[PDB]
């Protein structure tokens, strides 16, 4: 890649965990967002509307059935592609092959070169909202096959994904 | 649930006994709808537009790419997530656990929530429309698939959706 | 079918092959073109913008959740539904069993009625852009999926596409 | 067989979808009416008495231990026998091999010509009479018995007794 | 059921422990009488005329083909069926689904509403008459099939028919 | 146990997510802290000193080899033990069945009395600390073994622990 290639990371539209999630990729030397269609509308809820993320980060949205964003992994642009947080929604379709969002494209993309991916499944575990959350078999299905693809890691909480960010950069050496 | 909870009442784009989907849930005592995209093109072709439909029920439409009617769920109003008609598409991706429409993420967090769903996959059996058309294996092994859902009944006819509420309804007291 | 029966010919987001399939399409004495939302947006990146499609085909849009333009199929309008180029994304969804797009609810539709579909997976070896893009597990087992459907042809370079509408052709005597 | 042949439309002791299955033999070019003894009782409970079905069928009645009116098999004037609707008892007597009563009797007989039998099992699923209808595991493997035969089509619901209706004319040429 | 439901006890054609069988029925506190044809032909024979059971109970009788009595389980009438004494021949009709009979319908549709049946066949061991009768194995794999039955009580003796309603009404708390 | 029975939570040397697992101690009505002589050696680096701990709790310490505080279960104190953080060290000896600690001792005498116990293994995933810290198989064996006791719940984040916390107030009806 490029010397200057960034993380591309992607959110997708889940609440849960976002906040920690923006304040490890503002920690990335360089990062540039990807965001899906229900993450725009999410975000804003969660304290991180358009606004306030263009002030950290470059930002591209999902304004293009084709994901014409993609474009950039070609030229060598990113290193790594980042899925954090990722809904269950978004786990499915990278599970299947499935890429008809931003998110989905940019991994699937990523993959198809040989670009590494580490996918921040947040949804993987019982959670309170007080209202319980329990993930089903078709979720916990879906995080088993999506860990078995090629240069793919997949992670289940903030640790192990801060883990494999800082695994990413001492293989890059950055 | 509240006491005055109600049943999730979510349509997809199929004309296929629909009226007779809307007749059981007049019958039914408190419902709100849920539409998909596609219901709301195809509903109108049948004798249910918007204003027909809101003359008899709270109208919940898929205007938000996160599903913003779904936080509802979480206080309790609903105890029932019933799907009918439900196209085969929508079988397929609630088996495959994606959630890209109200309806498909109606019915996921209802699972994760332990909320029971009803699912009316209406397209099974042989039918004519003349036309013969017959489901492929495909939507045979997705039914078969969504039947093995936790929380979840699949039902392939009229008569056996009315036993399912009817079954429902005698849990819950109503 | 109607004497006067056409190709029904789906255009997917791919810029790969894209001009050499149209090319073949042009060959067929009658053949009306659909579009994926994503195949809008490419197509004219390659050459194909819709005034031009339009000087040659009639062209049917993905301007409807529901589908409308697959009616068509109900009268006999169409003997066969082709789809070159097939996305991977496409064929994803095809081998699932999902059809949320104009080219994937025209492949399901047909094959209730055991109208004949070949699908023309332009993704499915390595292939160079230098960068060179690999396909997946994932591409190769849905390709494998999507082959053993009823009434499928799936082909996977331009000769064998050329040889299945051949085929077809010859069937159909004309 | 001949030119005008019919088809032999047996009715039994069965009020559940009787109207709709009276309905669909109605929009049939040339059908005769058999009846049980036991639709005979029923069939005025739900508003076809003998005056009412005499006025739109030649009818058959039960008025013979030996089931006279089946010579006429012999003779080429049925070219499929058709049960509709068919209660459990009927269907476990046909599936044994048991031909006491008219409608039993015709399917057996018509079988051994290898003329098509289409058997409609109303009782197959859950229904709603409110009180709840389930068939037990007998009728279940009874239906699957059946459905084994020669020359038979089983069908579970209207909507597919309208399709192998539609089939059988196909086939028929009518 | 009703506060003031009852036993719905039938009768078949034995003769063989009749007699003690009714003088259980009449230990019961409500229960009334269903009659098959053959048990009218036998029971006067065996002391039991209908003058002399109509003095003692409400009795049913067989009159009709569709089983007009029936209808009386729908509204909660009944909350058991009792079959003493069972004849072979009503064993072999219940174990295979057969109901052209009242006590034979009424078990089968006791059934599929989930009322409790408890059947007595009253022929399975070697028994006087001097002559011997052994049951076949036809009449032993009967009883065991019909023994597997959901909701049924297979007994085999008076001690064991006593037993199976003592249990019955305990439930009821009778 | 009693009406006013409390939560014993016990802490271990850890000082990973110590923090947030004392947040989650005082959020909950009732509870007792019970430390290891590690964690009476760790806590006050991590913020968590014995004189601030007592403005919150009462405070149980491991100053004794025979753990004299645990008689306090024998008399329904305590409806629930907790251990978070629980080092590998502590998951080990609470799998082997060793107790010559406070923490392991008081989980050991729950078990042995039925008191339900939820142990939240805070090192089981790739963290860092930069340095990166990975459990070996015998931590991961570990946990398997330990997850498998009855009464039992092993939890491996803060979000499935406060969920564990939540089902339990709920079964306490707290």
């Given at each position: ?33 990807f965001l ?114 090629e240069y ?23």
């Amino acid at each position: 890649f490029k010397p200057d290639a960034r993380f591309a990371w992607c959110v997708t539209g889940s609440g849960h965990l976002l906040d920690e999630s923006i304040a490890l990729a503002l920690e990335l030397p360089r990062a540039d967002l990807f965001l899906s269609a229900a993450a725009e509308e999410v975000l804003p809820l969660y304290g991180w509307a358009l606004p306030r993320l263009r002030k950290h980060f470059r930002v591209f949205r999902d304004n293009s059935a084709s994901g014409v964003p993609v474009g950039m992994l070609y030229h060598g642009m990113y290193h790594t592609v980042v899925i954090a947080p990722a809904t269950s929604n978004t786990v499915a379709k990278c599970a299947f092959g499935i890429s008809d969002t931003l998110p989905t494209n940019m991994y699937a993309q990523a993959g198809k070169q040989c670009i590494p991916g580490i996918v921040f499944a947040c949804d993987t575990e019982p959670t309170v909202v007080w209202v319980e959350l329990r993930p089903r078999a078709i979720e916990l299905d879906n995080v088993e096959r999506l860990s078995r693809f090629e240069y793919t890691t997949l992670v289940r909480s903030l640790d192990e994904l801060k883990a494999a960010l800082g695994e990413r950069l001492s293989t890059l050496d950055l």
